[PDB]
Amino acid sequence: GRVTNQLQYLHKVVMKALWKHQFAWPFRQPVDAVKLGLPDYHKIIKQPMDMGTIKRRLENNYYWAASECMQDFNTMFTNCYIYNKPTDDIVLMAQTLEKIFLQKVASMPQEEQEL
Amino acid sequence: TNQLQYLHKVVMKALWKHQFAWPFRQPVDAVKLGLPDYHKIIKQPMDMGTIKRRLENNYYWAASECMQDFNTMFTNCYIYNKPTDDIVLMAQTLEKIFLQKVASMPQ
Ligand SMILES: CC(=O)N1c2ccc(-c3cc[nH]n3)cc2[C@H](Nc2ccc(C#N)cc2)C[C@@H]1C
Ligand SMILES: CC(=O)N1c2ccc(-c3cc[nH]n3)cc2[C@H](Nc2ccc(C#N)cc2)C[C@@H]1C
């Protein structure tokens, strides 16, 4: 991992906006299949992801490039759409957060430079 | 804008020619596919051909609006299909390319 302009932006602009959002609470920690009573969750979702894990990775300089962090956000949202029923409210919550994610990504610095 | 030209000439071009892109280049035809519930579940259909036409006709006012349409296309696929369907893996592969190319879009 390393520090880059784009990773700084993802941490301080993108994660900042998503973490505090009123729909963020289901995504701040890994899906807990015991707490939720979902014994098939890990049979369907093979790469769990959540914002707490992404945030710790940003804090610990785990990522080498901003695209790696973007892929983790994407996996978090895609797992939600794959696992849940189409009409579940969690899908709407993920959609709302993901639209913010994309809006902020559209304004990320263009060329990635190590700091 | 420079961003929209990049989404058209770089991002869409890379996705469109990919070996997994054929299901996504035109709207889902629910009648031909025998999927009578498709439009009961998916209320905002989206596909690459629609996005490309919008790019060509200067429909979009901002890059994020175009990105939202790509996202809707992929999300619809994940919401409608079974988790184990090959189409879901095809969408995941294309979406990863989409994000990789978006990371280099000019600001
Ligand atoms: C992110 C994701 O896909 N999921 C996820 C993850 C964490 C949490 C959670 C965290 C603390 N508590 N619950 C709840 C859920 C979803 N389930 C519900 C969501 C909202 C409401 C209401 N209102 C009721 C159920 C199930 C689903 C597998
Ligand atoms: C994008 C999307 O979600 N969908 C979508 C759209 C267009 C098309 C299509 C286009 C030409 N022909 N078929 C096929 C499909 C999927 N169905 C299949 C995909 C691959 C294979 C194999 N091998 C068999 C079925 C169903 C699903 C509703």
UniProtKB/Swiss-Prot annotation, chain A:
Bromo domain sequence ranges: 2-108
Coiled-coil region: none
Main function: Chromatin reader protein that specifically recognizes and binds histone H4 acetylated at 'Lys-5' and 'Lys-12' (H4K5ac and H4K12ac, respectively), thereby controlling gene expression and remodeling chromatin structures. Recruits transcription factors and coactivators to target gene sites, and activates RNA polymerase II machinery for transcriptional elongation.
Binding-site residues, a protein: 40, 83-85, 88-89
Outcome when changing residue 110 to A: Partial loss of homodimerization
Highest taxon of source: Eukaryota
Disulfide bonds: none
Residues included from the entire protein: 73 to 187 of 801
Subcellular location(s) per record: Nucleus; Chromosome
The record's note on its domains: The first bromo domain specifically recognizes histone H4 acetylated at 'Lys-12' (H4K12ac). It also specifically binds histone H4 acetyl-methylated at 'Lys-5' and 'Lys-12' (H4K5acme and H4K12acme, respectively). The second bromo domain recognizes and binds histone H4 acetylated at 'Lys-5' and 'Lys-12' (H4K5ac and H4K12ac, respectively).
Family listed: Belongs to the BET family.
Subunit structure: Homodimer. Interacts with E2F1. Interacts with (acetylated) STAT3; promoting STAT3 recruitment to chromatin. Interacts with CTCF; promoting BRD2 recruitment to chromatin.
Miscellaneous: Some specific inhibitors of BRD2 that prevent binding to acetylated histone are promising therapeutic molecules for the treatment of cancers or inflammatory diseases. ABBV-744, a small molecule, has been tested on tumors with success: ABBV-744 antiproliferative activity is mainly restricted to cell lines of acute myeloid leukaemia and prostate cancer and is able to displace BRD4 from chromatin. GSK046 (iBET-BD2), which specifically inhibits the second bromo domain, is a promising therapeutic small molecule for the treatment of inflammatory and autoimmune diseases.
Effect of mutating residue 86 to D: Abolished binding to histone H4 acetylated at 'Lys-12' (H4K12ac)
Effect seen on changing residue 102 to E: Loss of homodimerization
Substitution effect: residue 6 to A: Loss of homodimerization
Record organism: Homo sapiens (Human)
Protein name as it appears in the record: Bromodomain-containing protein 2
